[PDB]
Amino acid sequence: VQRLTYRRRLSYNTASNKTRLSRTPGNRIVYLYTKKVGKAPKSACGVCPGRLRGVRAVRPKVLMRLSKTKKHVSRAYGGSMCAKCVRDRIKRAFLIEEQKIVVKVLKAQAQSQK
Amino acid sequence: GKFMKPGKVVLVLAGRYSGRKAVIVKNIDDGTSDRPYSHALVAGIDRYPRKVTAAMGKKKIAKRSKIKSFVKVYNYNHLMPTRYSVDIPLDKTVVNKDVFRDPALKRKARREAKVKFEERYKTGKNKWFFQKLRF
Amino acid sequence: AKRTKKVGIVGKYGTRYGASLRKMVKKIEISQHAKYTCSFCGKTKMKRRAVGIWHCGSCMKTVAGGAWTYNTTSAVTVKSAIRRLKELKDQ
Amino acid sequence: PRKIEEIKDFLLTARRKDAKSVKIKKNKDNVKFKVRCSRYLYTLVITDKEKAEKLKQSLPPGLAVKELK
RNA sequence: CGCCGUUCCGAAGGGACGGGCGAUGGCCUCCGUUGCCCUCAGCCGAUCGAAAGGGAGUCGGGUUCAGAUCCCCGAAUCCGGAGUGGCGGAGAUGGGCGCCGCGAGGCGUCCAGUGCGGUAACGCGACCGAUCCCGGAGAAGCCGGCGGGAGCCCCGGGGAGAGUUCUCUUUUCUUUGUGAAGGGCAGGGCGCCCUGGAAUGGGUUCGCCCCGAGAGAGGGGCCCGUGCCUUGGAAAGCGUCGCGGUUCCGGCGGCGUCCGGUGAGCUCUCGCUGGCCCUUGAAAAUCCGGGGGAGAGGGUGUAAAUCUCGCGCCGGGCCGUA
RNA sequence: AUCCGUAACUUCGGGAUAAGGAUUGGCUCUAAGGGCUGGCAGCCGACUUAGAACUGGUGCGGACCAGGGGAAUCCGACUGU
Ligand SMILES: [Mg+2]
Ligand SMILES: [Mg+2]
Ligand SMILES: [Mg+2]
Ligand SMILES: [Mg+2]
Ligand SMILES: [Mg+2]
Ligand SMILES: [Mg+2]
Ligand SMILES: [Mg+2]
Ligand SMILES: [Mg+2]
Ligand SMILES: [Mg+2]
Ligand SMILES: [Mg+2]
Ligand SMILES: [Zn+2]
Ligand SMILES: [Zn+2]
């Protein structure tokens, strides 16, 4: 059967020399050089193990030529924080701020009672 | 007892408006055939009025006090009830669940809430409702 | 079926290293590979990541612990010592 | 290459200043109208022979036309 | 001669949005440039260091005595640039009141308009915004098992040519295309969403493993799609039979380039899940998102600022290559 | 390679392919082990395992590939250099 040869001078099986077979219109198998596999962004929460959704998994310099819609999500922090943790932050912000008002009134009250 | 009633201020927890403040215009605790879950029609602030100081002119202040509103139907699980209640009278003949069929009615519904929100804002009542939540 | 009489998990070492050393390392080998119940979520998923680092796959929490056990006896005692001294510090 | 679905947008593409020529290819099942613009080779695939002749006669004047065999 | 030293005994920034002053220009309208002043600035170490590390973007066919992913034919793409950098689209053409008309609609005012849809995951072709801040990618070991996709091999048939035919062999051999980029769709994956509330516990893998911190069951969203179709593209290539020519022509014609199956198979690759560590398995360049809201833009229009949208315009120097 | 069998000693992991036997070709059959569709019916299948008869001048892992074994003593634990 037909045996393949590299089409470039890099003769080693390094991470930047990976290939795939491809049958051409001339009816022969050649090597095509694959691009590296991209990664979707990781959440900014540093906790959720999964990657973000609604975003292209591409190499970092390819992000320059993509429109903005492909790189984010139509929501606060979209493309940077997962929805699950944005829910927790909205509550956490609101609930801690409420707690401040409560303590402020009690602290003011004891001052009045003092 | 039940507290999700009209005039109740809620924080939106999900969607394009996550983190915004809204006010319940109509609550449906049981649901319907279209929405089996419990939901509420809310009218909230997409874009809050900007901070104004005494160092700005009348014109700069007017420019900075405009509010962009929105009207939505929300699953209760995506709302965060708050103790604050805000009583702006929102015309229910224009702001109702039916505005979701044709965009022309929704524009009136959003325009209505824009005017009503802006008139209340200037009076200095319900200051919390018109301050963006920093989260 | 019971496959070994006494070696247990140190049966991987075969005949090598001596009975007493193999017996000794057996206690640590079992413990450093056990899944401890997580105090923060309750699911038995707490597992050793490196020496001294314990991680829970459910709530994703990480805890600095003993080399071979989730918490050492020395540390457990000190936590009660520090708790006690705190009160007298402010009565 | 781009594939065009409607005649209307093919005619417009032929009227662009950067359209150089139109290649008319006849197959057994369809007639393909390919126009070479600056960036893409747009193609219109026509399954009706009669519509093809009507189109070939209504291309903008001055566009080089080549029939392919 | 010099050596040590690399942030350590250093006044180590020559930059900038914007603001104020002058001087010059030109499509002298108003915009630019240039000099000064005000304001803002951690990076904190010059420089070198890899033809196997990181690092945008090119593939198919033809062609030579010797070169081709480089030449030619064709089809793409990245980067940078143009604001005299062009066109389209988006921003963006709404509402109330008063007349005019039967209305379709036209006038006059007063207001709005830095886009929109989905309960959600998230979606839509764009969809303003600086200093500042946060985050992501680049950017992560070794081994095991399992799964998907290819290439190859294998099996049953149609073709075309060839071989054997003393006898036998519906026989044996050869060959039987479709690139990058774009679109569509399979397939794989999800620690994504919504309903709901589960013990007589159930679901589930080769192993596991999963669940009131939400399982089963429904209905959805997203990522990769190297697989198939499509534009490419049959025009090309190949197989074969037949004619031509200068005959050293990318010569011209006819037909064909077909249909199924199968696998712990081998090779590569994508993915899920595990085990080992007193071993935890680069950095930087470079690119991106987010938070914030300093500003900017126009007063209802020949609308403006603005646009990561679709087209269009210009260019990519040096060195190696037998 | 299949089936059987296997001691001293032992740090219970080993020793161990311990040791020791039997079998093995060709040919013709039998049985079991699945998917798709609509306790049944039809259609597709991929290599295996096991048993039986017959058979050759007892030859059959027919070439190739492919551990001799046991009882002890000394030294060094082992793997590594
Ligand atoms: Mg390299
Ligand atoms: Mg292909
Ligand atoms: Mg997106
Ligand atoms: Mg290099
Ligand atoms: Mg479920
Ligand atoms: Mg042909
Ligand atoms: Mg913002
Ligand atoms: Mg060469
Ligand atoms: Mg022995
Ligand atoms: Mg030795
Ligand atoms: Zn998170
Ligand atoms: Zn836990």
PDB file of C-alpha atoms in Angstrom, chain A:
ATOM      1  CA  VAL A   1       0.000   0.000   0.000  1.00  0.00           C
ATOM      2  CA  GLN A   2       1.066   3.604  -0.428  1.00  0.00           C
ATOM      3  CA  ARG A   3       3.393   4.911   2.270  1.00  0.00           C
ATOM      4  CA  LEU A   4       3.543   8.550   3.318  1.00  0.00           C
ATOM      5  CA  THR A   5       6.319  11.098   3.730  1.00  0.00           C
ATOM      6  CA  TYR A   6       6.411  14.427   5.516  1.00  0.00           C
ATOM      7  CA  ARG A   7       5.882  17.472   3.317  1.00  0.00           C
ATOM      8  CA  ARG A   8       8.103  19.667   5.527  1.00  0.00           C
ATOM      9  CA  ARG A   9      11.646  19.510   6.861  1.00  0.00           C
ATOM     10  CA  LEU A  10      10.494  18.829  10.432  1.00  0.00           C
ATOM     11  CA  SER A  11      11.075  15.075  10.522  1.00  0.00           C
ATOM     12  CA  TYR A  12      10.158  14.589  14.192  1.00  0.00           C
ATOM     13  CA  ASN A  13       6.816  13.756  15.789  1.00  0.00           C
ATOM     14  CA  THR A  14       6.581  16.907  17.879  1.00  0.00           C
ATOM     15  CA  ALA A  15       3.459  18.731  19.044  1.00  0.00           C
ATOM     16  CA  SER A  16       3.739  21.156  16.107  1.00  0.00           C
ATOM     17  CA  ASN A  17       4.085  18.448  13.433  1.00  0.00           C
ATOM     18  CA  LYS A  18       0.810  16.537  13.737  1.00  0.00           C
ATOM     19  CA  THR A  19      -0.980  15.559  10.543  1.00  0.00           C
ATOM     20  CA  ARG A  20      -3.984  13.774   9.086  1.00  0.00           C
ATOM     21  CA  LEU A  21      -4.515  11.720   5.953  1.00  0.00           C
ATOM     22  CA  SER A  22      -6.427  13.208   3.035  1.00  0.00           C
ATOM     23  CA  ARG A  23      -7.417  11.767  -0.342  1.00  0.00           C
ATOM     24  CA  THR A  24      -6.977  14.366  -3.075  1.00  0.00           C
ATOM     25  CA  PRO A  25      -8.766  14.808  -6.406  1.00  0.00           C
ATOM     26  CA  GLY A  26      -5.742  13.139  -7.980  1.00  0.00           C
ATOM     27  CA  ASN A  27      -6.615   9.960  -6.080  1.00  0.00           C
ATOM     28  CA  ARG A  28      -3.636   9.851  -3.735  1.00  0.00           C
ATOM     29  CA  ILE A  29      -3.296  10.034   0.032  1.00  0.00           C
ATOM     30  CA  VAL A  30      -1.205  12.948   1.290  1.00  0.00           C
ATOM     31  CA  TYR A  31      -0.508  14.516   4.654  1.00  0.00           C
ATOM     32  CA  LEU A  32      -2.419  17.599   5.718  1.00  0.00           C
ATOM     33  CA  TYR A  33      -1.074  19.462   8.729  1.00  0.00           C
ATOM     34  CA  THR A  34      -3.714  19.915  11.402  1.00  0.00           C
ATOM     35  CA  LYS A  35      -4.074  23.020  13.523  1.00  0.00           C
ATOM     36  CA  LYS A  36      -3.793  22.658  17.273  1.00  0.00           C
ATOM     37  CA  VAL A  37      -7.003  21.944  19.162  1.00  0.00           C
ATOM     38  CA  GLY A  38      -8.416  25.044  20.805  1.00  0.00           C
ATOM     39  CA  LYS A  39      -9.885  25.397  24.267  1.00  0.00           C
ATOM     40  CA  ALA A  40     -12.994  27.241  25.354  1.00  0.00           C
ATOM     41  CA  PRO A  41     -12.478  29.748  28.170  1.00  0.00           C
ATOM     42  CA  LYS A  42     -12.483  28.589  31.765  1.00  0.00           C
ATOM     43  CA  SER A  43     -14.766  30.355  34.199  1.00  0.00           C
ATOM     44  CA  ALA A  44     -13.279  33.252  36.149  1.00  0.00           C
ATOM     45  CA  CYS A  45     -14.674  31.749  39.370  1.00  0.00           C
ATOM     46  CA  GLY A  46     -11.742  29.341  39.562  1.00  0.00           C
ATOM     47  CA  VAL A  47     -14.138  26.725  40.967  1.00  0.00           C
ATOM     48  CA  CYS A  48     -16.381  25.342  38.243  1.00  0.00           C
ATOM     49  CA  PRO A  49     -14.345  22.654  36.436  1.00  0.00           C
ATOM     50  CA  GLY A  50     -16.182  22.898  33.135  1.00  0.00           C
ATOM     51  CA  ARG A  51     -15.536  25.367  30.351  1.00  0.00           C
ATOM     52  CA  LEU A  52     -17.813  28.157  29.214  1.00  0.00           C
ATOM     53  CA  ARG A  53     -20.572  27.713  26.648  1.00  0.00           C
ATOM     54  CA  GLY A  54     -21.510  29.905  23.715  1.00  0.00           C
ATOM     55  CA  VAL A  55     -17.856  30.523  22.841  1.00  0.00           C
ATOM     56  CA  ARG A  56     -15.684  29.183  20.035  1.00  0.00           C
ATOM     57  CA  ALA A  57     -12.942  26.752  21.062  1.00  0.00           C
ATOM     58  CA  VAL A  58     -10.069  28.142  18.993  1.00  0.00           C
ATOM     59  CA  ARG A  59      -6.429  29.088  19.378  1.00  0.00           C
ATOM     60  CA  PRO A  60      -5.836  32.407  21.161  1.00  0.00           C
ATOM     61  CA  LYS A  61      -4.586  34.377  18.154  1.00  0.00           C
ATOM     62  CA  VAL A  62      -7.575  33.221  16.097  1.00  0.00           C
ATOM     63  CA  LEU A  63      -9.810  35.190  18.466  1.00  0.00           C
ATOM     64  CA  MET A  64      -8.609  38.384  16.800  1.00  0.00           C
ATOM     65  CA  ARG A  65     -10.540  37.697  13.589  1.00  0.00           C
ATOM     66  CA  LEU A  66     -13.795  36.489  15.159  1.00  0.00           C
ATOM     67  CA  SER A  67     -16.735  38.811  15.638  1.00  0.00           C
ATOM     68  CA  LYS A  68     -17.659  39.660  19.207  1.00  0.00           C
ATOM     69  CA  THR A  69     -20.832  37.557  19.269  1.00  0.00           C
ATOM     70  CA  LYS A  70     -18.745  34.397  18.984  1.00  0.00           C
ATOM     71  CA  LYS A  71     -16.491  35.225  21.944  1.00  0.00           C
ATOM     72  CA  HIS A  72     -19.041  36.082  24.640  1.00  0.00           C
ATOM     73  CA  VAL A  73     -22.598  35.587  25.885  1.00  0.00           C
ATOM     74  CA  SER A  74     -25.478  38.070  26.053  1.00  0.00           C
ATOM     75  CA  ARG A  75     -25.350  38.393  29.824  1.00  0.00           C
ATOM     76  CA  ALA A  76     -23.355  40.129  32.527  1.00  0.00           C
ATOM     77  CA  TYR A  77     -19.813  38.730  32.656  1.00  0.00           C
ATOM     78  CA  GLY A  78     -20.769  36.746  29.553  1.00  0.00           C
ATOM     79  CA  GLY A  79     -17.799  34.849  28.187  1.00  0.00           C
ATOM     80  CA  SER A  80     -15.891  35.336  31.450  1.00  0.00           C
ATOM     81  CA  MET A  81     -18.011  33.871  34.272  1.00  0.00           C
ATOM     82  CA  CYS A  82     -20.414  30.947  34.178  1.00  0.00           C
ATOM     83  CA  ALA A  83     -24.098  31.653  34.719  1.00  0.00           C
ATOM     84  CA  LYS A  84     -24.110  29.471  37.831  1.00  0.00           C
ATOM     85  CA  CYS A  85     -21.578  31.668  39.615  1.00  0.00           C
ATOM     86  CA  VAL A  86     -23.151  34.916  38.409  1.00  0.00           C
ATOM     87  CA  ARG A  87     -26.344  33.790  40.126  1.00  0.00           C
ATOM     88  CA  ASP A  88     -24.353  33.235  43.314  1.00  0.00           C
ATOM     89  CA  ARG A  89     -22.684  36.647  43.084  1.00  0.00           C
ATOM     90  CA  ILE A  90     -25.916  38.588  42.554  1.00  0.00           C
ATOM     91  CA  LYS A  91     -27.377  36.971  45.660  1.00  0.00           C
ATOM     92  CA  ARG A  92     -24.098  37.218  47.564  1.00  0.00           C
ATOM     93  CA  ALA A  93     -23.761  40.913  46.753  1.00  0.00           C
ATOM     94  CA  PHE A  94     -27.386  41.685  47.589  1.00  0.00           C
ATOM     95  CA  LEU A  95     -27.552  39.483  50.684  1.00  0.00           C
ATOM     96  CA  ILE A  96     -24.336  40.806  52.224  1.00  0.00           C
ATOM     97  CA  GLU A  97     -25.384  44.391  51.520  1.00  0.00           C
ATOM     98  CA  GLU A  98     -28.695  43.740  53.266  1.00  0.00           C
ATOM     99  CA  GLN A  99     -26.829  42.320  56.252  1.00  0.00           C
ATOM    100  CA  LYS A 100     -24.856  45.569  56.443  1.00  0.00           C
ATOM    101  CA  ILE A 101     -28.042  47.625  56.755  1.00  0.00           C
ATOM    102  CA  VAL A 102     -29.346  45.345  59.508  1.00  0.00           C
ATOM    103  CA  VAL A 103     -26.165  45.618  61.566  1.00  0.00           C
ATOM    104  CA  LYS A 104     -26.062  49.355  60.901  1.00  0.00           C
ATOM    105  CA  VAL A 105     -29.523  49.793  62.437  1.00  0.00           C
ATOM    106  CA  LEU A 106     -28.734  47.581  65.435  1.00  0.00           C
ATOM    107  CA  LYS A 107     -25.412  49.367  65.915  1.00  0.00           C
ATOM    108  CA  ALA A 108     -27.208  52.711  65.672  1.00  0.00           C
ATOM    109  CA  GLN A 109     -29.942  51.485  68.023  1.00  0.00           C
ATOM    110  CA  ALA A 110     -27.526  50.433  70.770  1.00  0.00           C
ATOM    111  CA  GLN A 111     -25.886  53.830  70.311  1.00  0.00           C
ATOM    112  CA  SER A 112     -29.301  55.385  70.911  1.00  0.00           C
ATOM    113  CA  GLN A 113     -29.875  52.978  73.798  1.00  0.00           C
ATOM    114  CA  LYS A 114     -26.390  53.943  74.989  1.00  0.00           C
TER     115      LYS A 114
END
